[PDB]
């Protein structure tokens, strides 16, 4: 159920080499809150990859601490997938967290590396969140 304390979800960015604006994945519910993958080009140059939480809510009283593993899937060999971990207290003023320079744009888009296929790159997040505060009183 959505009240689960953790989950793993993926989002495949298409026409990746042409990415020019920030993109958002559909939500994955954990602790009944919507979590989304956020991807964006940063400085071509680097791939920005962040985890977002409950960003559309108007509430300013919520907070949810969580740890997560952000990974870009290598479709040829999982062991070659690149990941980084985060630990963050998500709340309305800091509703997303990750790396603006998760990895080199030239590397991810390199056809010989195995991260991109048919100009698509799959992002994955394994999030483990604690019970939130200021949400379900």
């Amino acid at each position: 159920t959505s009240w689960r304390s953790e989950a793993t979800f993926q989002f495949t960015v298409e026409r990746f080499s042409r990415l020019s604006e920030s993109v958002l994945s559909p939500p994955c519910f954990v602790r009944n809150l919507p979590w989304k993958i956020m991807v964006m080009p940063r400085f071509q140059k680097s791939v920005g990859f962040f985890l977002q939480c409950n960003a559309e809510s108007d509430s300013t009283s919520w907070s949810c601490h969580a740890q997560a593993v952000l990974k870009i899937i290598n479709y040829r060999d999982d062991e070659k997938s690149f990941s980084r971990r985060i630990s963050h207290l998500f709340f309305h003023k800091e509703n997303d967290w990750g790396f603006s320079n998760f990895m080199a744009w030239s590397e991810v888009t390199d056809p010989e590396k195995g991260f991109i296929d048919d100009d698509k790159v799959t992002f994955e997040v394994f999030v483990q969140a604690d019970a939130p505060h200021g949400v379900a009183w």
Binding site: E94, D96, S100
Partner: peptide
Amino acid sequence: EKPSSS
């Protein structure tokens, strides 16, 4: 790499 918000 240091983490941060977007």
